[PDB]
Amino acid sequence: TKYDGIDLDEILKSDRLFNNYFKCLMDEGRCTPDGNELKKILPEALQTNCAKCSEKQRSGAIKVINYVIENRKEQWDALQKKYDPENLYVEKYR
Ligand SMILES: [Cl-]
Ligand SMILES: [Cl-]
Ligand SMILES: [Cl-]
Incomplete structure (x- = not known):
């Protein structure tokens, strides 16, 4: 998975x-x-x-989401209130 020419694990860890x-x-x-x-x-x-x-979009998004939930908690809160205010991902799929 790459975003803008960069490996996504690499983006997440930097x-x-x-x-x-x-x-x-x-x-x-x-x-x-x-x-x-x-x-x-x-x-x-x-x-x-x-x-x-598509599976490709989904695979990258789920990678980002789970990384941020575990390793970037404050940023996760910001993203969750904006994009998932009912907290459906943590409650219903993860
Ligand atoms: Cl591109
Ligand atoms: Cl790319
Ligand atoms: Cl950090």
Whole structure:
């Protein structure tokens, strides 16, 4: 899985890279092309387990979501209140 030419594990493990995508998702900074695509699918990923997504979109989104839930907890809270206010992902799929 890659976003904008970069391995996604690599983005997730780097504060600098991840903070760029986090800001994109939080409407606080400009999105890269794949960051904007992640933004489009993130509420579906959280609220329906990416029911209508392609497997590729879904695999990347679930990787991001589970990493952030476990390793970037404050950022997870921000993303969850914005994209999954009913907390459906943690309650109903994970
Ligand atoms: Cl690209
Ligand atoms: Cl890419
Ligand atoms: Cl850290």
